[PDB]
Amino acid sequence: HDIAELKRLDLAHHLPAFADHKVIAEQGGSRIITRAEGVYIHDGEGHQILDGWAGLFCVNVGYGREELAKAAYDQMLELPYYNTFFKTATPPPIELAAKIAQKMGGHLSHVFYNSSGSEANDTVFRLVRHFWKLKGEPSRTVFISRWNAYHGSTVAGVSLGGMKHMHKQGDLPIAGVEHVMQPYQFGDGFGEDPAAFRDRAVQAIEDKILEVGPENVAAFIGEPVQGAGGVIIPPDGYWPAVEALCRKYGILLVCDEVACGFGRLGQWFGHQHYGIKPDLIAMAKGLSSGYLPISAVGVADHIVAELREKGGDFIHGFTYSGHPTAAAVALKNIEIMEREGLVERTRDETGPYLAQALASLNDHPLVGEVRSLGLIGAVEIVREKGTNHRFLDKEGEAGPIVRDLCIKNGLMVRAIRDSIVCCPPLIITKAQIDELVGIIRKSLDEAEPVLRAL
Amino acid sequence: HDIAELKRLDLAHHLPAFADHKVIAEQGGSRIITRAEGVYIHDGEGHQILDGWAGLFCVNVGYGREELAKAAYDQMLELPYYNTFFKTATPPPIELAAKIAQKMGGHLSHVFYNSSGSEANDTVFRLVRHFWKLKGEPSRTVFISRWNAYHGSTVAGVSLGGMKHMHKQGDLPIAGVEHVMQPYQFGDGFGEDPAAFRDRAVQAIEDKILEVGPENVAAFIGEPVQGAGGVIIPPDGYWPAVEALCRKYGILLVCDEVACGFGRLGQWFGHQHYGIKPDLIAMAKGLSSGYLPISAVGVADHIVAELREKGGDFIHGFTYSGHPTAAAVALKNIEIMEREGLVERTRDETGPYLAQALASLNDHPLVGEVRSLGLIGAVEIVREKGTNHRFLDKEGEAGPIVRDLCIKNGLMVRAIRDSIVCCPPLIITKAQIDELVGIIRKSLDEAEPVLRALK
Ligand SMILES: *Cc1c(COP(=O)(O)O)cnc(C)c1O
Ligand SMILES: *Cc1c(COP(=O)(O)O)cnc(C)c1O
């Protein structure tokens, strides 16, 4: 590879995602990643980087899976593409559907296929509203979400999400979406009793339901753990109370499993850790470990019963819905996870080990709080020990500084506000977990003098 | 494959797209497609079917490309995925970006990556509105489209599209989207002078611009040829007049190239056939010939200038934006098109031949009109020769009947209302074009007695 040419071509022809393109230009183009193996990334100048984010919350089985490349090759030779539009289907999405249904459990029996997690939430949006029309309750149209939630980057995905700065671009959210407080203990309930803060966050949902009018509410949607929002782990008892709220007013419960799904929290889906029974779930990312684009919506049997008994077209779907090659890779990816027991390993081995390893950072003068569940975790950066006070009293200044030192020291982790977030592949060893935490501590030590000088 | 078992699993676990699931259940599950080669499809019960729709307007290089399977395998070994979120990129999307920009021409210099054509229009929606905010014209928010347009299946894609029945599901369109008449001569301008009907269709866009308020309009979006709507080919002079309209009121011109792109109309992009210069285009389907999911938005240089000069995050993108394996396959797909010259072949050879072959159906008692451009075409079904009158005076009855007979006779074509539309892979031979048209005529002959017996 000609790295200088790829950087020039990047600026001249490529618009990266979630990027300030003035910043990209000022650094002379994007940083070129050329190869990867196991849990490590290699860039244009030869630097080995421990990928503490598994690509983008997705590469769960790790890099270097020749077995997955082979699965794609074989299916592309036999049948690279056909549609599911013409009363037709192909083997791979059908066999993958039965496998996903096995992992979803409960009444989640069917899947609708898309490509990205964002589309899956578009599918949730249209299917939920169509379902209530078939049920004879057409007034049920409003979706209730939370501030700092992330549900994708489509128009509907941004609307369902709670990123106010993301809402601005596109003049979003669209109508029929409401947002309430997030159960963020460290930021918004610091010093509150967890049970009392939880009740406040649950009550905010009920207040919104009553304001909208229960007969007008279609569903509540939420991530089991808010990933892109900074690993917001809700207090104990939050999700059971939210489910009871949904059942009380007869609204659907939707869990966005795009990040929490497929082993991230020690379960096949995040909602199973909390023992709740959603009516729909969105999934992607870890579905194929990012090896090929594919996503799906898990659909409850009683939703399918309306489609099967009332009839009528559900006028919804994408060209690549059920793509046989992407489906075959996702199927093999699940089989690799089953074979190697990566879901159980996260719950019983690496998850707890990550929790103890991150807890050793608690004594650092810059660390306000560490938290983790399975193989996702966050480290809070504070200017005053024992508080949630942030440097310059302006969240987002200290974060990037610590992040850049981690990257300089060979660890790819990201800063969400002043929270350093990690999300490594599920194959990470305990020694590599110690390496990850070691680099964070090393970067915090270096960050201390520059942060004090702000 | 255990076909009976797959049908069981299909009903028990799979929700197909654009489907009546009661109908699927009543037939005992979806029809299983197992393998394909060249332009032919094979199902569970052994039937060979000429794929007159190239999968779903997408399989342009045809089936059986081991070269594309190899390109995917090699890239997945070296680097299966990394993101473009962290000021990072990988070689394949960068190399694909330069190739696409070379084919787009004009001021279309940059691409933003997604997975589906629907997402591409979501990217158009947010980028156009963000662009006008950076330009200091925040009132420019409204998109103008057309009835019977198709722009995807996301909430924004359905909103931008003009399928009224699709709008109902989801209670769409969202605010800030207006729809005007489609330039459908056969259905809505039968007996009108084409130039006067064209002017009527262009004036409806201007009327909407003035109603919304020119300072409040962000862009006009349209397919060069309306694909899913039934191959609606606009009258001559329509698109040049539409471009002038956009330039007159200073609004952006967006062409949805997801179906028309990559050789379908004899050009790398449909708008190039009409000589117009859109500010943004959406592309997918033929981008990778459907071999892997990938899509892109072509972005004009002056749009990028706002991002580069004003700065600020464009808070938009997908996990698989710029997926290296999908990009490598799309790049190899374009190289196959270049090597085999399918773009020039469609413009000069197979495109005109399809028009000549379809024109032989003009003498059939059921055919009201045939039309085509490149390798997409439509055959109108009428109950009265020389009119646009439809069987039972209710569009959509005759269509499915002729379509089902085509499928029985070994040709996969679809009926849009009472229009039989074809869109075969670009590698189709002239003999296979004659086979396709022959099966259509055979099915029309068989359909004539049952259609005359309606009611
Ligand atoms: C990543 C993410 C999405 C969006 O998924 P894409 O494939 O990038 O469109 C949606 N919801 C959650 C919880 C996510 O983490
Ligand atoms: C196919 C189509 C779309 C939607 O593309 P998907 O990949 O199915 O989401 C958008 N616009 C046009 C013109 C199309 O033909």
Side-chain angles (χ1 to χ4, degrees):
Chain A
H1 298 127
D2 191 342
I3 302 301
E5 185 65 9
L6 291 175
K7 287 183 145 53
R8 184 191 68 87
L9 291 174
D10 184 65
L11 287 186
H13 302 298
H14 182 214
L15 294 177
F18 279 74
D20 187 323
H21 306 272
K22 182 159 149 49
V23 171
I24 302 285
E26 280 168 349
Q27 78 170 26
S30 300
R31 192 180 186 155
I32 307 306
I33 302 307
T34 60
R35 63 190 199 277
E37 185 65 72
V39 301
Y40 291 96
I41 250 66
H42 299 90
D43 68 354
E45 306 173 7
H47 296 140
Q48 202 180 14
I49 307 174
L50 206 183
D51 191 357
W53 259 55
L56 197 70
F57 293 169
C58 58
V59 190
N60 289 9
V61 299
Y63 302 91
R65 293 295 185 159
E66 191 278 335
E67 189 174 7
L68 291 179
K70 176 62 170 163
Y73 179 86
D74 291 338
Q75 184 57 43
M76 289 178 73
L77 275 187
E78 186 189 335
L79 181 57
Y81 172 82
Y82 200 71
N83 70 78
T84 64
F85 286 52
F86 305 154
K87 311 183 214 165
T88 47
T90 61
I94 293 175
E95 288 185 294
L96 175 60
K99 175 66 72 179
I100 294 179
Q102 184 207 147
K103 302 312 184 194
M104 290 189 300
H107 60 177
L108 263 26
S109 57
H110 293 70
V111 300
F112 190 100
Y113 287 113
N114 347 264
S115 291
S116 63
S118 298
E119 289 172 325
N121 283 326
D122 286 78
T123 300
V124 171
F125 188 97
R126 297 190 69 212
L127 180 54
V128 163
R129 285 189 169 180
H130 184 56
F131 163 77
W132 285 121
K133 303 282 188 272
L134 296 179
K135 291 272 290 186
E137 304 185 45
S139 294
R140 289 191 184 276
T141 65
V142 175
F143 295 83
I144 303 189
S145 186
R146 300 170 298 182
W147 299 117
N148 197 38
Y150 188 70
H151 298 297
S153 189
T154 54
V155 169
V158 175
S159 296
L160 293 165
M163 306 303 184
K164 288 181 176 191
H165 292 91
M166 199 177 195
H167 286 173
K168 295 257 71 176
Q169 302 182 355
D171 300 0
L172 304 182
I174 62 175
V177 183
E178 299 290 335
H179 305 83
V180 306
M181 64 177 290
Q182 62 167 342
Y184 183 24
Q185 181 95 62
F186 186 80
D188 305 327
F190 192 87
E192 270 184 73
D193 175 65
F197 174 72
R198 170 200 63 200
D199 295 347
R200 271 207 312 117
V202 177
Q203 187 59 50
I205 299 172
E206 182 159 30
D207 294 353
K208 184 57 70 177
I209 293 169
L210 292 169
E211 181 198 287
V212 174
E215 71 278 15
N216 299 317
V217 178
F220 173 84
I221 183 181
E223 306 152 83
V225 172
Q226 290 164 244
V231 193
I232 312 300
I233 303 168
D236 295 350
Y238 175 83
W239 273 117
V242 172
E243 184 176 38
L245 251 194
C246 292
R247 303 316 175 208
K248 178 182 181 180
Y249 293 100
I251 70 171
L252 300 180
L253 170 62
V254 180
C255 287
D256 191 338
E257 297 283 358
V258 169
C260 299
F262 293 92
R264 183 52 54 183
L265 304 186
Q267 303 288 340
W268 283 100
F269 295 97
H271 69 263
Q272 294 163 343
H273 175 261
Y274 294 94
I276 57 177
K277 293 151 294 299
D279 300 277
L280 302 89
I281 62 174
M283 70 188 75
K285 286 188 174 104
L287 171 54
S288 61
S289 292
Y291 274 68
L292 282 183
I294 182 172
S295 70
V297 177
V299 182
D301 54 5
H302 71 91
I303 309 288
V304 183
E306 290 306 306
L307 300 170
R308 290 278 168 79
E309 294 170 3
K310 306 296 202 295
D313 288 357
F314 181 43
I315 313 165
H316 179 77
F318 309 95
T319 298
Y320 300 135
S321 290
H323 194 282
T325 297
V329 166
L331 182 58
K332 184 66 72 188
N333 173 73
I334 296 171
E335 296 175 359
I336 289 169
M337 293 178 61
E338 290 176 314
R339 183 197 309 151
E340 292 173 17
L342 298 182
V343 176
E344 307 87 72
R345 183 173 183 262
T346 306
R347 184 182 58 200
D348 300 332
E349 285 293 275
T350 50
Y353 194 90
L354 177 62
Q356 66 84 21
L358 287 172
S360 67
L361 299 168
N362 279 318
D363 69 330
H364 197 279
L366 294 178
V367 171
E369 147 170 316
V370 307
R371 58 181 181 267
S372 63
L373 176 62
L375 279 177
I376 191 172
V379 177
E380 297 278 10
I381 302 163
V382 300
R383 65 173 170 82
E384 198 182 339
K385 204 79 173 153
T387 72
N388 63 1
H389 301 160
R390 312 292 189 175
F391 282 95
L392 299 181
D393 294 321
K394 188 171 72 183
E395 267 202 294
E397 300 297 304
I401 296 180
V402 181
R403 172 203 70 201
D404 290 349
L405 291 166
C406 291
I407 298 178
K408 175 190 70 68
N409 290 327
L411 172 66
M412 181 56 76
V413 289
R414 312 300 300 174
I416 305 172
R417 292 166 285 105
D418 290 332
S419 300
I420 299 289
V421 168
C422 63
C423 190
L426 306 183
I427 57 158
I428 186 169
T429 68
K430 295 184 175 178
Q432 291 166 335
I433 290 173
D434 291 328
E435 182 188 341
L436 181 148
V437 176
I439 294 170
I440 287 175
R441 178 179 273 280
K442 181 184 191 291
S443 303
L444 286 171
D445 288 351
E446 296 173 24
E448 187 167 17
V450 48
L451 292 183
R452 295 298 172 195
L454 259 301
Chain B
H1 299 288
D2 192 342
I3 302 301
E5 190 68 8
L6 291 175
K7 287 183 145 53
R8 180 191 65 86
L9 291 174
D10 184 64
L11 286 186
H13 303 299
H14 182 214
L15 294 178
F18 279 74
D20 187 324
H21 306 272
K22 182 159 149 48
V23 171
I24 302 285
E26 280 168 349
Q27 78 170 26
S30 300
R31 192 180 186 155
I32 307 306
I33 302 307
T34 60
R35 56 192 195 87
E37 182 64 73
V39 301
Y40 292 96
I41 257 64
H42 299 91
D43 67 354
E45 306 173 7
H47 296 117
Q48 201 180 14
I49 307 174
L50 206 183
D51 192 357
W53 258 55
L56 197 70
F57 294 169
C58 58
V59 190
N60 290 9
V61 299
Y63 302 90
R65 293 296 185 160
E66 191 278 335
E67 189 174 7
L68 291 178
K70 177 62 170 163
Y73 179 86
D74 292 338
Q75 184 56 43
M76 289 178 73
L77 275 187
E78 186 189 334
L79 181 57
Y81 171 82
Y82 200 71
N83 69 78
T84 64
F85 285 52
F86 305 154
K87 310 184 214 165
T88 47
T90 61
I94 292 175
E95 288 185 294
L96 175 60
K99 175 65 71 179
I100 294 179
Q102 185 205 54
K103 302 312 184 195
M104 290 190 300
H107 59 177
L108 258 30
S109 57
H110 293 70
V111 300
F112 190 100
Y113 285 113
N114 349 267
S115 290
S116 63
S118 298
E119 288 173 325
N121 283 326
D122 286 78
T123 300
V124 171
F125 188 98
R126 297 191 70 212
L127 180 54
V128 164
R129 284 190 168 180
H130 184 57
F131 163 77
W132 286 121
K133 302 281 188 271
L134 296 179
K135 291 273 290 186
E137 304 185 45
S139 54
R140 289 191 184 276
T141 65
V142 175
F143 295 83
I144 303 189
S145 186
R146 300 169 298 182
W147 299 117
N148 197 38
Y150 189 71
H151 298 296
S153 189
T154 55
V155 169
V158 175
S159 296
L160 293 165
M163 306 303 184
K164 289 180 177 191
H165 292 258
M166 199 177 195
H167 286 173
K168 189 207 94 66
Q169 302 182 355
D171 300 0
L172 303 182
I174 62 174
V177 183
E178 300 290 335
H179 304 82
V180 306
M181 66 176 291
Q182 62 167 341
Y184 184 25
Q185 180 95 61
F186 186 80
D188 305 327
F190 192 87
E192 268 183 76
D193 175 65
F197 174 72
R198 171 202 64 200
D199 295 347
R200 270 207 311 117
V202 178
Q203 187 59 50
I205 300 172
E206 182 159 30
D207 294 353
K208 184 57 70 177
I209 293 169
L210 293 169
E211 180 198 287
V212 174
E215 73 278 16
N216 299 317
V217 178
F220 172 84
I221 183 181
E223 307 152 83
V225 172
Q226 291 164 244
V231 194
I232 311 300
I233 304 168
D236 295 350
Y238 175 83
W239 273 117
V242 172
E243 183 176 37
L245 251 194
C246 292
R247 303 316 176 208
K248 179 182 181 180
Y249 293 100
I251 70 171
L252 300 180
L253 170 62
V254 180
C255 286
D256 191 338
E257 297 283 358
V258 169
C260 298
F262 293 92
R264 183 52 55 183
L265 303 186
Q267 303 288 340
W268 285 101
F269 295 97
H271 69 263
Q272 294 163 343
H273 174 79
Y274 294 94
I276 57 177
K277 293 301 201 189
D279 300 277
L280 302 89
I281 62 174
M283 70 188 75
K285 286 188 174 104
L287 171 55
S288 61
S289 292
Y291 274 68
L292 282 183
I294 183 172
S295 70
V297 177
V299 182
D301 54 5
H302 71 91
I303 309 288
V304 183
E306 289 306 306
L307 300 170
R308 290 277 168 79
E309 294 170 3
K310 306 297 202 295
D313 288 358
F314 181 44
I315 313 165
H316 179 77
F318 310 95
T319 297
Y320 301 135
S321 290
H323 194 281
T325 297
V329 166
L331 182 58
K332 184 66 72 188
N333 172 73
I334 296 171
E335 296 175 359
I336 289 169
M337 293 178 61
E338 290 175 314
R339 183 198 309 151
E340 292 173 17
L342 293 351
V343 176
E344 184 175 348
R345 185 192 302 178
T346 306
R347 184 178 58 248
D348 300 333
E349 286 294 277
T350 50
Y353 193 85
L354 177 62
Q356 174 185 11
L358 287 172
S360 67
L361 299 168
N362 278 317
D363 69 330
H364 197 279
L366 294 178
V367 171
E369 147 170 316
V370 307
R371 59 181 181 267
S372 63
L373 176 61
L375 279 177
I376 192 172
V379 178
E380 297 278 10
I381 303 163
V382 300
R383 65 173 170 82
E384 198 182 338
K385 202 78 174 153
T387 72
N388 62 1
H389 301 160
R390 312 292 189 176
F391 282 95
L392 300 182
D393 295 321
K394 188 171 72 184
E395 266 203 293
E397 300 297 304
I401 296 180
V402 181
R403 172 203 70 201
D404 290 349
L405 291 166
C406 291
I407 298 178
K408 177 266 287 184
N409 290 326
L411 172 66
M412 181 56 76
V413 288
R414 312 299 300 175
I416 306 301
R417 293 166 285 106
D418 290 332
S419 300
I420 299 289
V421 352
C422 63
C423 190
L426 306 183
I427 57 158
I428 186 169
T429 68
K430 295 185 175 178
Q432 291 166 335
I433 290 173
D434 291 328
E435 182 187 341
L436 181 148
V437 176
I439 294 170
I440 287 175
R441 177 180 273 279
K442 181 184 191 291
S443 303
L444 286 171
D445 288 351
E446 295 173 24
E448 187 167 17
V450 48
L451 292 183
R452 294 297 173 194
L454 258 302
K455 183 185 297 179

